[PDB]
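Narrative progress, year one. The postdoctoral researcher (J.K.) led the effort to move from monomer predictions toward full complexes, under supervision of the PI. The following entry was the first complex the group processed end to end, covering 237 residues in total.
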Amino acid sequence: MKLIFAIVQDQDSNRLSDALTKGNFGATKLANTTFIIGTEDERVEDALAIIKENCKARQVGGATVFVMPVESFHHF
Amino acid sequence: MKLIFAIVQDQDSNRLSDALTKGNFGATKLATTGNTTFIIGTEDERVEDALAIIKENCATVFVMPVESFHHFLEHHH
Amino acid sequence: MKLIFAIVQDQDSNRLSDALTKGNFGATKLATTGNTTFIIGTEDERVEDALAIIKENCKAREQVGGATVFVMPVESFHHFLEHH
């Protein structure tokens, strides 16, 4: 399991949550906007691909992503 | 040391902070999406206690390994 | 690469972002509860520099001051950029 911290532009935010849900990822937003995204190790590449694809220029556009190891995952 | 990310509903939020304080855990609340995310630093032993509180007062939880922890503190008169 | 979570007092916040930019660190500020939380991506070597800034830029409120920091390992880092 991996925890992904994705920092993206506000402009990109809404469409990225749509794309992330569409792709079956559970995500959380905190305002640039920061997304926290839990994924299984295999699905990581898919997630990045979505993020890459949904980051556009406002003239300039970008996204920064961190992939963090998870000791354990729990859903209650 | 572990860093715990807990995503919970607002309805659960206020009670959980009360329960978390009560249990001697230092926590931080972020208003997110309508949900709240709690970041909870804990020692490896106390992790189970923390999870139990969350479970009982609600949720999705991640337990992250911490390379290094630091606290700086000052008093003056 | 390391991800740093720094919880600091609001009063310290603006000055710490100034100091963190000045030191060439990219940081992100979250409004939280009272305290502000900074997320700071850094290379393993620069970690000590970052801590020092945080330590230095935490002052006493009112009498009392403090900051709490977590340094998290990063499996992988990714950056995507475009111009038009």
